[PDB]
Write a protein that binds this DNA or RNA. Structure first.
Ligand SMILES: [Mg+2]
Ligand SMILES: [Mg+2]
Ligand SMILES: [Mg+2]
Ligand SMILES: [Mg+2]
Ligand SMILES: [Mg+2]
Ligand SMILES: [Mg+2]
Ligand SMILES: [Mg+2]
Ligand SMILES: [Mg+2]
Ligand SMILES: [Mg+2]
Ligand SMILES: [Mg+2]
Lengths: 159, 169, 133, 292
RNA sequence: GUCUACGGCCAUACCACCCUGAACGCGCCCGAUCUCGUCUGAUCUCGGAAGCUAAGCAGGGUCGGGCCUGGUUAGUACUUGGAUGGGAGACCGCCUGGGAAUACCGGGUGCUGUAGGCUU
RNA sequence: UGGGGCGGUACACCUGUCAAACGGUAACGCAGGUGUCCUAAGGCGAGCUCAGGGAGGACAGAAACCUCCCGUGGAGCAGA
RNA sequence: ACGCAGUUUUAUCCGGUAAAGCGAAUGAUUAGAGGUCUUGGGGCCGAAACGAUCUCAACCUAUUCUCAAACUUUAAAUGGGUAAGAAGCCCGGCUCGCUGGCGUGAGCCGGGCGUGGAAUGGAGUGCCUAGUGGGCCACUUUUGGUAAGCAGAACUGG
C-alpha cells in the first residue's frame, strides 16, 4: 500500500535536465500574462514556492486572476468518470505560453484579408482546410536506363 | 628586453608554533611584534589530536606577514644568520622558497630574562607586476604562462642579488 | 582444458570464458508453511541471450579439428541446445583476417599485447612523427 | 605519477556559466530583484539609473528592461565637462556631482518639464527630497544600480546620486553613506558634505605640499600645472560649471565619413588551406629522411 | 573594420599551448592628507598620470581534447492490433502499421538589441 | 491473520522501487524511518570559499601550524 | 441550427518504460602491454638499496571481456492534455480612491463585418428511488513461490 505524500514519484519530473542546473534565465520573469490567455504548466523544482501538484504537470489551462508574482489558472481534471474544474494558484517560473492557438490566429487574419481583398473579383475561393487527398495521375520517365534488378541473399551465420 | 618583467618580493610570512596555549604564546607574541613593529595574530587548531596534546578551537600558534622594504631588511638579517648558502631542495615549482631558524637571538636582538628563546620560519613569496588581477574582485583573470615563474628563475635571482650559493642534494 | 592439453600441448592455445554469474537465486526452505516467503541467497547464475558467446579458443590452423572435438565434449555439461562455428575474424580481435595482415604492414594497427590498437588520421601529428620513423 | 583531473570526462560533465559572470561583470542575484516589475502592471517600466567608475572616467545612464536587451534613454559621460569649463579632476567626488546633475537636466528637457522641478539651485549638502506637485505631471522616479561596488561610507556613487536629486529626480535614499556622518554618534553634519563637493580636500592637500615639499608636489599634480589651475579658485570653478549645466545641457553628436576601409585584423583560414599545410608538412618530414 | 557601458540567447561562446595588436578606449601602474577598512593601503576606499603592451582583453593557429550537427549502425533491435500458425515447452516465424541508440566517417567553432567613441 | 494460538503490526504517518514512460493501482511484497530537535540551526545585509590532490618550510614524524597551484561541487545544509 | 461524441486529421505540449550504454558519471568485474609511480617481502643474484629483478592487496597511461528493480548520457511504439471562430475580429467614445514620466489595465456604451477540417446522431435539466456492497475466467504485461485446477494486481472482453 502506497502513501500520500505530495511529491511521491517525482525523482525525475521535479529534476533539472542535463547541464541546465543553476540560476534561472530571466526572460521567464519578464513575460506578460494577461487575462484569458491559454497556458501550459511544467513544474521547475529549482524553486519550491508555489509549485503545483503532480496531477497538473503537463496540463493546459486558462488564466482568471493575476497577482504580484503568481497567476490563477482554471484546469480540468478527470476523477472517476466525472470531470471537474479547478482553480490553482501558481507562480510564474512554472509556466509558459502555448503556441496551440497561434496557427488559428494566422489563419483568421489571413482569412479576413483574403476575403476582403479579392472580393471585388466575385469568386468565393477556398477558405477552409481539407485533408490530404489522393495522388494525381502522372507519368514516369525511363530516361534510357532499364531499372535495377533486386533479389534476396543467402543466409549466413555471421555470429 | 624586460621592462615590466622584473622580479620583486610580494610578501614575507613569519610563523611560530608552540603546541601549548597561554604564557608561552604571549611571550612569543612580544617577539614578533618587536621584530616588525606590528601586532601579530593568534591561530587556532582545526581538529583535536591526542599524542600532540591538543583540543579543537584552542589557540596554538602565532603568525604575521609583512610587505614593502621592511621585508628586504628582515630577509637580509635572516640570511646573515644563514651565511647566504641554500640548497636547491628548498625551492618550489611555483617560484617560492623559505627556511627556518632555530634561535631568534642571532638576529641582533637582546635576551630578556623574562622570555626564553624561540625558533621561527621564514617563507618568501616572489612576484612581478600584473598579479593583483587574480585577487581583483572586479574582473578576475588568470595570468598566462609567459608571465609565470619557475624554480630555475628563482635560483639565478638569488645568485645574482646576493651572490648566494646553491648546494647539491 | 584436459583434452586440449592431451591433444596439442600445454602452450598451443589460449582459452577464454565470456560470461559472468551476476544474478542471484533465492531459496525458501520448508525445514508456518507459506507465510513470510522470501528466500535466502543460496546461489549465483548467469543469463544468456540468443547469439551470445559462452566460450572461445585461440590457436593455430593445423589444430582445427581438435578445437572442435574439445568443445563438443563440453556441450554435454549444459542444459540446452548449443552449436559451434568458426569465425572469420583474426583471433579475439574484431577485424577480418583477409584485411588484417595487409593492415598491420601499413601502420593502422599496432600489436599492443594480446590485442591490437587501431589509430585514425585525426590526432596531432607528433604521433605521426613518432611512427614513420 | 598523479591522477589527471581535467580529462575527457571532466569536460563532458562540465557546465558553463552565463557570459557576463565569466567575464566578471554582473550579479544576477541582485539584478533579479531590481529589473522585474510586478505582474499586475504589465508594461509599466521600472527605470533604473546606472553608475560605473573606470580608472579615468565616469559613466551614468538611465535604462529599462525588455526581453531583447535593456533600452537606454539618457546618458552622460564625465569626459565632456571641458565643454562646460572643468578641465581636470575628472575622477573625483566632484565630477560625479556635475555628472549626475547634467544627466537629470538633460532628461527633463526631453520629456519637457525642465521649467519646473529645479531642485536645490543653491547647494547646501542638506537632505532634500523632491515633491510631485499637483495639477502638473508626475515626478520621475527611479532606482539605483551600484553593481559590484561596495557601498561603504564615501563612495563616488553617492556623489552622483546627489547631483540628480539636487537636479530634480525623485529617488529614495538615506544619509548614512554621505560624508559628514558619525558612526560614534549617528549624526549628520551637512557642511563636510559640501566640502567634498567643491573640492576643498584637494586644495588642502596641495597647499599642504607646496609648503612642505615641492618635488612630490610636481609629481602628484603635474596636470594641474598644465591648464594652470591652483587651489585658489576650485570653489568658484565648480560653482560656475553648475550654472552652465543648468542653462545649456542639450547634447550634440559628431559626424565623420568616407573611411578608407582598411582591415586591421586577420581573417579566418579556410578548409582547403588547412588541408594543404598538413600535406606539405608530411612531405618535408619524409624528405628529411631521404636526406639521410 | 573595431572598442566601451548595459544586456538576451547561455560551450558553434569551454580547456591547454603558440603569433599579432595602428588610433580611440580598457587596464597595468604612482602615492595614503582627508573618506573608509585592514595583524599588513595585499584586497576595499580616496587622490593621481612618469612609464608599458610583458600580462588581462581582442583577433588568429593546432591532420588539438570537448561541444553543435549530418551519415552509417539499420528498415536492425523493439513495438500496436490479428490468426483452429509452428513447437513437448522455452520461444520462433508471418499479416497489418510505427521505428531507436553506441562504435566508425564527415563538416562548424558565437549570434545579435539600445546608447556612444576611433577608423579625418 | 494462506484454519486459530504463540510471534509480528502490514491498526495514524514519510522516501525510493514493484507500477506496465500522464495520474491511480494490491499481498505477513523489498529496503529504511517517526512520536523528536532549535534564542538560533528563525529573519535581513555584507564579505568569503568546500572535499581532496601536489610542492615547499627549525624540532615536525602518516597526521599539529605557515604559503602557493589544481579543484563543477567529487563537501556541507539536525535526523531516513 | 446550434450542441454533443472510450472516433480520425492538422498544428502544439507532457512523460524517462522497452531497447541501448559504460573508450560517458555512480557501483561491480576479467586479462594482459608501456609505470621498481610506489609501501614492504615465504623471498629474489647479494652488505642490501629505488644495483638489478619480479611480483603481489592495491595502485599512473592507453586498450580489453561481462553487468544493473531500487544506475544512466541517449531514447521509441501505444498513450494523456489543449485548439480548430458570433462567448470571434474591428472602429469610436465614456468611468476609476487602482498603477503612474506622459501612461497602463479593467469595466460600460454605440456601430460594422456569418458557412470556418473529416465522418455520426435530437439534446438538456430536476426530484423520488430499489437490489447490491462474498466474486470468477482467457489472451497480453506482471509480483512471491520449485510448481500449482496456488496466493495478489494492470487492459479489454466474457
Ligand atoms: Mg518510475
Ligand atoms: Mg548586494
Ligand atoms: Mg599601490
Ligand atoms: Mg596585452
Ligand atoms: Mg604580447
Ligand atoms: Mg576536433
Ligand atoms: Mg480473528
Ligand atoms: Mg503506466
Ligand atoms: Mg533493459
Ligand atoms: Mg444506494
Amino acid at each position: 500500500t502506497n502513501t500520500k505524500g505530495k511529491r511521491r514519484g517525482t525523482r525525475y519530473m521535479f529534476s533539472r535536465p542535463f547541464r541546465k542546473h543553476g540560476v534561472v534565465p530571466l526572460a521567464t520573469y519578464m513575460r506578460i500574462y494577461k487575462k484569458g490567455d491559454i497556458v501550459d504548466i511544467k513544474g521547475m523544482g529549482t524553486v519550491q514556492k508555489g509549485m503545483p501538484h503532480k496531477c497538473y504537470h503537463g496540463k493546459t489551462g486558462r488564466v482568471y486572476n493575476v497577482t504580484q508574482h503568481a497567476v490563477g489558472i482554471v484546469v480540468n481534471k478527470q476523477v472517476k468518470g466525472k470531470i471537474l474544474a479547478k482553480r490553482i494558484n501558481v507562480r510564474i517560473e512554472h509556466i509558459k505560453h502555448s503556441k496551440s492557438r497561434d496557427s488559428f490566429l494566422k489563419r483568421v487574419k489571413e482569412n479576413d484579408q483574403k476575403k476582403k481583398e479579392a472580393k471585388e473579383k466575385g469568386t468565393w475561393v477556398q477558405l477552409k482546410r481539407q485533408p490530404a487527398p489522393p495522388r494525381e495521375a502522372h507519368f514516369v520517365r525511363t530516361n534510357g536506363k532499364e531499372p535495377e534488378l533486386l533479389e534476396p541473399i543467402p543466409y549466413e551465420f555471421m555470429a | 628586453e624586460n621592462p615590466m618583467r622584473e622580479l620583486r618580493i610580494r610578501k614575507l610570512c613569519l610563523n611560530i608554533c608552540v603546541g601549548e596555549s597561554g604564557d608561552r604564546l604571549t611571550r612569543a607574541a612580544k617577539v614578533l611584534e618587536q621584530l616588525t613593529g606590528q601586532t601579530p595574530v593568534f591561530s587556532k587548531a582545526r581538529y583535536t589530536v591526542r599524542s600532540f596534546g591538543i583540543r579543537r578551537n584552542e589557540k596554538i600558534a602565532v603568525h604575521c606577514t609583512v610587505r614593502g622594504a621592511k621585508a628586504e631588511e628582515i630577509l637580509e638579517k635572516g640570511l646573515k644568520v644563514r651565511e647566504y648558502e641554500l640548497r636547491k631542495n628548498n625551492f618550489s615549482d611555483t617560484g617560492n622558497f623559505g627556511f627556518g631558524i632555530q634561535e631568534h637571538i642571532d638576529l641582533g636582538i637582546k635576551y630578556d630574562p623574562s622570555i626564553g628563546i624561540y625558533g621561527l620560519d621564514f617563507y618568501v613569496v616572489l612576484g612581478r607586476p600584473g598579479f593583483s588581477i587574480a585577487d581583483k574582485k572586479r574582473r578576475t583573470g588568470c595570468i598566462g604562462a609567459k608571465h609565470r615563474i619557475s624554480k630555475e628563475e628563482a635560483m639565478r635571482w638569488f645568485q645574482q642579488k646576493y651572490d648566494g650559493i646553491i648546494l647539491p642534494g | 582444458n584436459k583434452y586440449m592439453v592431451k591433444s596439442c600441448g600445454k602452450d598451443g592455445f589460449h582459452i577464454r570464458v565470456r560470461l559472468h554469474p551476476f544474478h542471484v537465486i533465492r531459496i525458501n526452505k520448508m525445514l508456518t508453511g507459506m507465510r513470510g516467503a522470501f528466500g535466502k541467497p543460496q546461489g549465483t547464475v548467469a543469463r544468456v541471450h540468443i547469439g551470445q558467446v559462452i566460450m572461445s579458443i585461440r590457436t593455430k590452423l593445423q589444430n582445427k579439428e581438435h578445437v572442435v572435438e574439445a568443445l563438443r565434449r563440453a556441450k554435454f555439461k549444459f542444459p540446452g541446445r548449443q552449436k559451434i562455428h568458426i569465425s572469420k575474424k583474426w583471433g579475439f580481435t574484431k577485424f577480418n583476417a583477409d584485411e588484417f595482415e595487409d593492415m598491420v604492414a601499413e601502420k593502422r594497427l599496432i600489436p599492443d599485447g594480446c590485442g591490437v590498437k587501431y589509430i585514425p588520421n585525426r590526432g596531432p601529428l607528433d604521433k605521426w612523427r613518432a611512427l614513420h620513423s | 605519477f598523479v591522477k589527471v583531473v581535467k580529462n575527457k570526462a571532466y569536460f563532458k560533465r562540465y557546465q558553463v556559466k552565463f557570459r557576463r559572470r565569466r567575464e566578471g561583470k554582473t550579479d544576477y542575484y541582485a539584478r533579479k530583484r531590481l529589473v522585474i516589475q510586478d505582474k499586475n502592471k504589465y508594461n509599466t517600466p521600472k527605470y533604473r539609473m546606472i553608475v560605473r567608475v573606470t580608472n579615468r572616467d565616469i559613466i551614468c545612464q538611465i535604462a529599462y528592461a525588455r526581453i531583447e536587451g535593456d533600452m537606454i534613454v539618457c546618458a552622460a559621460y564625465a569626459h565632456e565637462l571641458p565643454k562646460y569649463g572643468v578641465k581636470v579632476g575628472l575622477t573625483n567626488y566632484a565630477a560625479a556631482y556635475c555628472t549626475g546633475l547634467l544627466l537629470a537636466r538633460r532628461l527633463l528637457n526631453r520629456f519637457g518639464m525642465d521649467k519646473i522641478y529645479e531642485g536645490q539651485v543653491e547647494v547646501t549638502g542638506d537632505e532634500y527630497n523632491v515633491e510631485s506637485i499637483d495639477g502638473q505631471p508626475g515626478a520621475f522616479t527611479c532606482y539605483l544600480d551600484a553593481g559590484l561596488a561596495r557601498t561603504t561610507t564615501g563612495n563616488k556613487v553617492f556623489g552622483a546620486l546627489k547631483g540628480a536629486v539636487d537636479g530634480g529626480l525623485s529617488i529614495p535614499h538615506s544619509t548614512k553613506r554621505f560624508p559628514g556622518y558619525d558612526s560614534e554618534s549617528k549624526e549628520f553634519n551637512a557642511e563636510v558634505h559640501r566640502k567634498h563637493i567643491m573640492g576643498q580636500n584637494v586644495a588642502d592637500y596641495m597647499r599642504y605640499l607646496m609648503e612642505e615639499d615641492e618635488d612630490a608636489y610636481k609629481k602628484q599634480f603635474s596636470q594641474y600645472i598644465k591648464n594652470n589651475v591652483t587651489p585658489d579658485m576650485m570653489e568658484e570653478m565648480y560653482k560656475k560649471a553648475h550654472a552652465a549645466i543648468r542653462e545649456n545641457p542639450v547634447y550634440e553628436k559628431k559626424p565623420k565619413r568616407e573611411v578608407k576601409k582598411k582591415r586591421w585584423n586577420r581573417p579566418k583560414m579556410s578548409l582547403a588551406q588547412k588541408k594543404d599545410r598538413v600535406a606539405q608538412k608530411k612531405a618535408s618530414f619524409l624528405r628529411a629522411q631521404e636526406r639521410a
